[PDB]
């Protein structure tokens, strides 16, 4: 879990300590990561999804999820994949809510993200290469 914090690892160092790790020779190539990053714009609907889906059922199925408050948006990082069912969001909110309505306030994806049925998924998997995309 703590490896997915915004300020994990090198980010906790300041001053010279930061610089020496930033310029270390091990850190001049990218390091493959199994994480995904999801950014949700703050709104009435999103704040309910955060509290009653992501931080309850979501964290239960994926204990690696970290959610951070960045004032205008929620920053979310997890191992592997995050999944949000628009049909469950609609029941929580009490109003019609398709996957396209969910996308109204999904603001960024660092990962492979896709829509299938009522489900929005952001995954570390290389969709279209390692696993095929499908129709309904």
């Amino acid at each position: 879990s703590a490896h997915n914090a915004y300020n994990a690892g090198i980010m906790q160092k300041t001053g010279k300590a930061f610089a020496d790790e930033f310029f270390a020779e091990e850190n001049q190539v990218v390091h493959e990561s199994n994480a995904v990053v999801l950014v949700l714009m703050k709104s009435d609907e999103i704040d309910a999804i955060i509290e009653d889906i992501v931080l309850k059922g979501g964290k239960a199925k994926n204990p690696s999820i970290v959610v951070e408050d960045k004032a205008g948006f929620w920053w979310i990082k997890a191992d592997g994949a995050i999944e949000i069912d628009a049909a469950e969001a609609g029941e929580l909110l009490g109003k019609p809510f398709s996957v396209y309505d969910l996308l109204i306030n999904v603001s960024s994806t660092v990962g492979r993200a896709y829509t299938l049925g009522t489900k929005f998924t952001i995954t570390s998997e290389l969709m279209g290469l390692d696993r095929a995309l499908t129709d309904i």
Binding site: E91, G94, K95
Partner: protein, 389 residues
């Protein structure tokens, strides 16, 4: 300026600091679902139910009410603000109705606004297209202008029948269903007149005034049975359940559906009318949305109320007997219009009109009659109407 310019507590540094010091660091209750105690009709409480249910302040002596005591002010003589004396039907809970489309005010005007603006874009393009050129000018100036124009008075009469319903009915979801149904009816009347005014801009000397349609509605034998039923439903009764049931489930579902769909819309697509089906697309959509809600109120709920269902069907069957006879009469006058149009096999010949009546009456039997135990012989009603052919 003469008065103080008020500092906002949200953004003024001093007031925001004072407000921040007074707000507790924790919530004082954890129940955040607005009117969490409404019983949901579906899997979870909907926003439509939350915003609507129990806004009506009924006491416990009106079935389903949560309040107590008498009203604060009644009519001279003692008539209560709302009361059980307003209808013959009875129920264990007047708040049990749900519109299946879940329309509170915002989705309702949102949808009609889409239709409002798209209609004007379609008219501007239709005028630029020149598509009026292919309409049979006899259908246009004789049937459309005069007899379609007169149908607006049926829609307008059914609209006005809802005035006492909107005052008298006994719960909030029923009242929303009734008011939206009323606005859609007067919308239909205004749209028919919009079409006539539109044609007047494209065809010189086309008269879009209502004078002739009004004369036809009030004096032409073709509409005499329809006008009589509508005047009765509107001004002859005040039981608000009787008005909704007679208006939508009998008259409009039989005569109204025949006139709008089987006559004016269907025959538009034999005489080359590319304009009228755009408007009947709206009235028919409004008819099916209204039907979903009437069905829930009368068929699903009141006819099966655990204590009063059979009691309620007694009145529903009586009303249906009386108003179906009026509507059959109205259709028998109306089918005389077919003498005024060119005979097209399978459409305006006797076999065509007979199949169209089998559709209206057979649909009505499945949609309504079977579900309240009303026994009807479709063939016998078809033959009664053809008597006027």
């Amino acid at each position: 300026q003469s008065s103080q310019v008020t500092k906002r507590g949200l953004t003024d540094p001093e007031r925001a600091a004072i407000i921040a010091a007074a707000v507790p660091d924790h919530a004082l209750d954890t129940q955040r679902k607005y009117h969490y105690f409404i019983q949901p009709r579906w899997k979870r409480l909907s926003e439509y139910e939350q915003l609507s249910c129990y806004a009506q302040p009924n006491p416990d002596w009106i079935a389903g009410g949560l309040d107590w005591g008498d009203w604060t002010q009644k009519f001279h003589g003692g008539r209560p603000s709302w009361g059980n004396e307003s209808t013959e039907l009875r129920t264990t809970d007047w708040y049990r109705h749900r519109d299946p489309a879940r329309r509170w005010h915002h989705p309702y005007v949102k949808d009609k606004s889409e239709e409002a603006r798209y209609t004007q874009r379609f008219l501007a393009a239709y005028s630029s297209e020149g598509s009026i050129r292919t309409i049979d000018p006899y259908w246009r100036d004789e049937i459309l202008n005069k007899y379609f124009g007169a149908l607006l008075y049926s829609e307008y009469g059914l609209f006005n029948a809802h005035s006492s319903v909107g005052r008298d009915c006994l719960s909030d979801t029923i009242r929303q269903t009734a008011v939206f149904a009323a606005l859609d009816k007067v919308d239909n009347a205004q749209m028919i007149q919009m079409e006539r005014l539109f044609i007047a801009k494209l065809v010189p000397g086309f008269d879009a005034s209502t004078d002739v349609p009004k004369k036809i509605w009030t004096t032409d034998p073709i509409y005499s049975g329809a006008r009589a039923t509508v005047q009765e439903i509107w001004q002859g009764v005040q039981d608000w359940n009787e008005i909704l049931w007679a208006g939508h489930a009998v008259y409009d579902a039989t005569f109204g559906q025949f006139a709008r769909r089987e006559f004016f819309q269907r025959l538009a697509t034999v005489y080359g009318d590319t304009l009228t089906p755009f408007f009947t697309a709206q009235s028919q959509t409004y008819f099916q949305t209204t039907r979903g809600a009437i069905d829930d109120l009368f068929v699903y709920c009141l006819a099966n109320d655990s204590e009063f269902g059979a009691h309620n069907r007694t009145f529903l069957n009586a009303w249906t007997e009386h108003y179906l006879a009026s509507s059959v009469a109205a259709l028998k006058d109306f089918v005389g219009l077919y003498a005024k149009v060119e005979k097209v096999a399978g459409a305006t010949d006797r076999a065509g009109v007979s199949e169209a009546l089998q559709r209206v009456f057979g649909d009505w039997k499945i949609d309504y009659a079977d579900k309240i135990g009303f026994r009807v012989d479709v063939d016998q009603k078809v033959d009664a109407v053809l008597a006027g052919y």
